[PDB]
Design a binder for this molecule. Sequence first.
Ligand SMILES: CC(C)(C)[C@H](NC(=O)C(F)(F)F)C(=O)N1C[C@H]2[C@@H]([C@H]1C(=O)N[C@H](C=N)C[C@@H]1CCNC1=O)C2(C)C
Ligand SMILES: CC(C)(C)[C@H](NC(=O)C(F)(F)F)C(=O)N1C[C@H]2[C@@H]([C@H]1C(=O)N[C@H](C=N)C[C@@H]1CCNC1=O)C2(C)C
Lengths: 299, 302
Amino acid sequence: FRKMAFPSGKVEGCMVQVTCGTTTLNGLWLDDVVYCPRHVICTSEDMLNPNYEDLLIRKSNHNFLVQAGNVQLRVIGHSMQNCVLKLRVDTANPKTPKYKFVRIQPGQTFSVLACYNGSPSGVYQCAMRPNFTIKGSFLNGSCGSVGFNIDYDCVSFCYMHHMELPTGVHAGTDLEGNFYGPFVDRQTAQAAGTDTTITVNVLAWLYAAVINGDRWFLNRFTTTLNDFNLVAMKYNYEPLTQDHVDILGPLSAQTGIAVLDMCASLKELLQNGMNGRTILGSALLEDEFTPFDVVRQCS
Amino acid sequence: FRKMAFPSGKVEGCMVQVTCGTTTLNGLWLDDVVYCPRHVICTSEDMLNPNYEDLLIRKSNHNFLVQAGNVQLRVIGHSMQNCVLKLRVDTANPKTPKYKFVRIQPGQTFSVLACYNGSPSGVYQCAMRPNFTIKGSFLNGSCGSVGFNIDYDCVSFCYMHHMELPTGVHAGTDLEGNFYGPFVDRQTAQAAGTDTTITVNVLAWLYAAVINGDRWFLNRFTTTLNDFNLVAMKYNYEPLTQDHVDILGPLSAQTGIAVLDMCASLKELLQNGMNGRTILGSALLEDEFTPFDVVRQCSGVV
Ligand SMILES: CC(C)(C)[C@H](NC(=O)C(F)(F)F)C(=O)N1C[C@H]2[C@@H]([C@H]1C(=O)N[C@H](C=N)C[C@@H]1CCNC1=O)C2(C)C
Ligand SMILES: CC(C)(C)[C@H](NC(=O)C(F)(F)F)C(=O)N1C[C@H]2[C@@H]([C@H]1C(=O)N[C@H](C=N)C[C@@H]1CCNC1=O)C2(C)C
């Protein structure tokens, strides 16, 4: 049972390089617009305390160098939408897929295509954490890499990468330029809210463990939804709603384990610990598989 | 530190579907040849005990339905090479990347593009285990999905998927049709052998830890390679080869920790355990990152 990303090719054909001065990062080229993080306009010194509207008014179209592979795209217009810059170019991208911009909910997952200098580097799956950070793998020059999901050849872009917090987690925006979380695109010490664990995802993953034949954590105890939620809150787990119970329906029907029965197992896991044992090869309870991710891989 | 697959676009453009009878699986379309598992020619009853040479004699070019999407590619020739079928088609794939076929060693990792009906579905990173299985995610119809690495726009194909063993792990061939491990493409009682831990990759993981400042496990001991190999096997760890010592060269140089010093550090971990501390925030020693994977992730390769 593996974390599985979507095939990245439809996104690869959209990645370009954007340079302003000596600051270079990635952009997303859809039709005749390139989307990229607005801090491309900052000198490394500007990033310490930027006034973006002031910085942007001092730029012309010619200050932006957009490279698609070896070919330069002429910038014929620019505007800022929140923390994203939209560069109108003189060429429409022939590989533009059917796409949508979506803002995802905490606990949902997406694939990241990490890129450097407009060139794709690697692909992996992330979840939007409850504190609105992601546990990614990004280095210098990765900004403008995007997160996405793919549904019947439609790419739903949900994340553009902007920054790494001192704890090593990552923060970014939707494609309208609005940050996930209480962060700002300024080079200054920033911390996230205390994180919490995505309960419905842990349950989905326990169902995956049972499907794959691992049942040592199961029990005969029972719990009500409210009593489970009291324990979840005590252990910094997110509340489980009735909608989550409904969403876990198919996995519950497939394994014959009632949702509240799996909740009772999780409650004892939180209260007893894992006694050094593992589940699906993991020494910790995994919360980055949604119920959808689990069904898509088991079914 | 996380499992990063290669971008899959160059491989997606090569995936087709191959049907013989009612059996559909995936094929790899490079230039004017489609490569696929030979059991596409079997009926469900055939797979229980197939004679591939005679079953292939009873097939002709016009028995093979090869489709890119729903577009049929006319088959103009067929041959069998080990457990792969090679179907010559009348159209050269314009999306063919620069490519090589390679046979990998246990411990080496690769990206898998899981496909169904010729349509790519997902991508993930896999390590070839010492017992010649991969811990993959493959459902019905996944056969012919491929594994690959990339280096500077050259795709090295190393795996084609054929089967699932009862423990849930997966087995297949190189692109010349030779199985990894003792497996055969027959629906017969087969089982994965006992597995071992990939020592060279654990060591790479230890170097990755050191690079990030997590180095409590660096001890004052060293060892010889032969002494280490003999002890590691008592802990179900693979012995190191000379090639393993050399592939750890770059990480040894970057950290200044000699390979045999790191072997001595790992030996102490095996002999005394962790003692309730973690490495890279884990109580388990990870063995599915190669030394190249560590450098690839810590650098910005393409
Ligand atoms: C870690 C760094 C301290 C230097 C800083 N972080 C914080 O200032 C914080 F603490 F507020 F997060 C930070 O990320 N940036 C500083 C400057 C941009 C951003 C930045 O360099 N983005 C990179 C885009 N190519 C991706 C980074 C590089 C390392 N890994 C990544 O993911 C902006 C906020 C404008
Ligand atoms: C698990 C199955 C019992 C049915 C059987 N296994 C064993 O007979 C073993 F136990 F010996 F391995 C087995 O896999 N096959 C039987 C028959 C081919 C192969 C097969 O169906 N391949 C599928 C290709 N599309 C991929 C499979 C589907 C499930 N998950 C996968 O990956 C061949 C060996 C010729």
